[model samples]
Target: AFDTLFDHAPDKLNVVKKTLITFVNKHLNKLNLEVTELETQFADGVYLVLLMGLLEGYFVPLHSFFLTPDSFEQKVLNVSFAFELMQDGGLEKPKPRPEDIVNCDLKSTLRVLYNLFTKYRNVE
Candidate 1:
């Protein structure tokens, strides 16, 4: 098991992240959505925001978005939350379960780079 490389908790988090990205991208593409899709660190970042949902046992339904209209909305929202985190910077508040003290400055660059990137997301 990945416990060989990391403490079990962190390794377990990484596996869920991989699944979030892998499962989202693979299944979402099978649909005809034009809303959002995971690629790059955005996948991991969005997965973290949604980790709160996972903590509340929202995992399968969250992943199940790919098969319906809800997937498009969830996909866009997830990506938005992620670039928000990236601009938030630091490796803090990733998917290790939540605590009461939350953080962010809210000075943002998400929409800027996101607009620039979407050019490529669809171009290729």
Candidate 2:
């Protein structure tokens, strides 16, 4: 599920994935957190929300989604809410399913992160 989703090899996707990691850490470092593995780190959707809130300059209410998501449904709900917040902001949303992201689907995760990296790469 993590490896075979892409039609092409690691050339372009690798670059995008690395850039997304850098983009994430650029903001996340403020909280003394850094992502070494994008899929696993984002699987729970906790840092994703914090990253989005940091980029978009808004505070997400904790009640809007589970902070320490325990179930698959909770993780999916968190990712879907992240997508909703992404759409609410200026970045163009992708077609990737939240379930795919929650399951650590590499293609879907990259799609989501690439959209975010493109939008917020220059953010201070």
Candidate 3:
């Protein structure tokens, strides 16, 4: 039943999946506090590094197709939602602890998200 639902209801699921993936990809770097050594940190760092590299190479261009004068509004909404989720704590297995959310530098995260949004929206 779950498989059938996921396969048949793919559009709805994709929207949710994409939103969650975006949130994870955005926050993975900031959440890597468990790594104590700079050298050993590469394992945790690679997820975010790879995502950013892929965005630089591919996703940014693809995102441009969806841009418009109205795109800023959508970008604002998406970033705001991302901020709320990060602040309230993200959706993931073994959910983020309350102390982690308390420690998160949300203002900086929002700023980074806004900058990335603008860069992706503009002509290079």
Candidate 4:
């Protein structure tokens, strides 16, 4: 019954808009330098948090929203990545030199996230 209900539910439908991808790609392309292949464990953690923020922004409005004490923990983890990126010389302060630009894998990351979302559609 739940499967049938989910199958028919309009709200459960997931659509990936090309316009949204374009917008995200535009922001991603602004990063000018290639990401270093040797990322520190700390950097990986930060990146994960940032990804969660991107996911939350995409997911919370429609359904399966988080609402519990544990939600705050997730929120904190998400925000911490954003803060670390800012503090560790974010796009505003590129490393390797003052004029250097930091590169990000926005397209790749978005693709991965979209694929993950697809797996969740119509699931219980």
Candidate 5:
């Protein structure tokens, strides 16, 4: 469905996804969190929040977002909170909405992760 959004082939997109996962893990590793599937895992928002905290060198309080995010709206809230943190840390909001991430839209998710991957890839 998202083929129209890309100029690269599927294989290349997979490569990008793998690379971004590695990029995210580079920081997440410190906290013992690992992200193997960006689509499913990030939909919950917990990992994303922690990634932001690690990148920004601070801890995000548990009360700041739903830890379990059992409901759909709660999940979106977590991702939105992460987005706000990303912005405050100087990265522009990427193309996807919090809802898009919650829906597990790969293209939208990739845009967010790719932006982070590129922005911080050199910082560390």
Candidate 6:
């Protein structure tokens, strides 16, 4: 399932995100699995030079699309729900910061912050 997910041809974000989802699901004990065999053809002590580039490329365009409404609307999808899911699963939350984040520009962003602060008063 992971092989065919992303248009690699895109920044292989699916590789990263799907890896996360898989691990998270595995942790949640939702998927039936047993690690019988694990193998990698690549050499050990391998440099993840491509990883940094892939991640940078992945967010650059996604931000260009999602944060900038024009880009998002320009490539608007056939399915709104799908996009929302994509956003919530990835882009919905802001990255961590020293200060408790509250990007009040969008109500959704504010809501996330509000929920965080309200639910966990120690957040501040």
Model 4 Cα lDDT, one tens digit per residue, 19-116: 33433333323333222231221123333333333433432231222222144344344334343443443233212221111123333333333443
Clash count, predicted structure 1: 0
Better of 5 and 6 by lDDT: 5
Best of the two (3, 4) by TM-score: 3
lDDT against true structure, model 4: 0.32
lDDT score, candidate 4, position 39:
22
Tell me the tens digit of each residue's lDDT in model 3 across 20-122: 3454445444444232222122222223233343334433343432223144444444333333333333222213222222234333332333334444433
Q: Which is the better candidate, 1 or 3, if ranked by TM-score?
A: 3
lDDT of each: 0.35, 0.82, 0.36, 0.32, 0.83, 0.27
lDDT of 6 by residue, 28-52 (tens): 2322422211121001101111111
Write the number of the candidate with greater lDDT, choosing between 4 and 5. Answer: 5
- TM values, all candidates: 0.23, 0.86, 0.26, 0.21, 0.87, 0.20
User: How many residue pairs clash in each candidate at the backbone level?
Assistant: 0, 0, 0, 0, 0, 1
> Candidate 5 at 59: error in angstroms?
0.6
Candidate 3 ranges beyond 4 A from true positions: 1-47, 58-103, 122-124
RMSD of 4: 17.2
Best by lDDT: 5
List, residue by residue over 65-120, the lDDT tens digit for candidate 1: 33222443554545455434434543333332111111221111222222323332
Q: Which ten residues in a row have the lowest lDDT in candidate 6?
A: 40-49
Clashing pairs in 2: none
Query: CA shift at 91, candidate 2, in angstroms?
Result: 3.2
Query: What pairs collide in candidate 6?
Result: 7-10
> What's the lDDT for candidate 3?
0.36
The local distance difference test score of model 2 is: 0.82
TM-score of structure candidate 3? 0.26
Model 3, C-alpha of 33: deviation from truth (Å): 19
> Candidates sorted by lDDT, descending order?
5, 2, 3, 1, 4, 6
Q: Model 3 misses residue 49 by how many Å?
A: 1.3
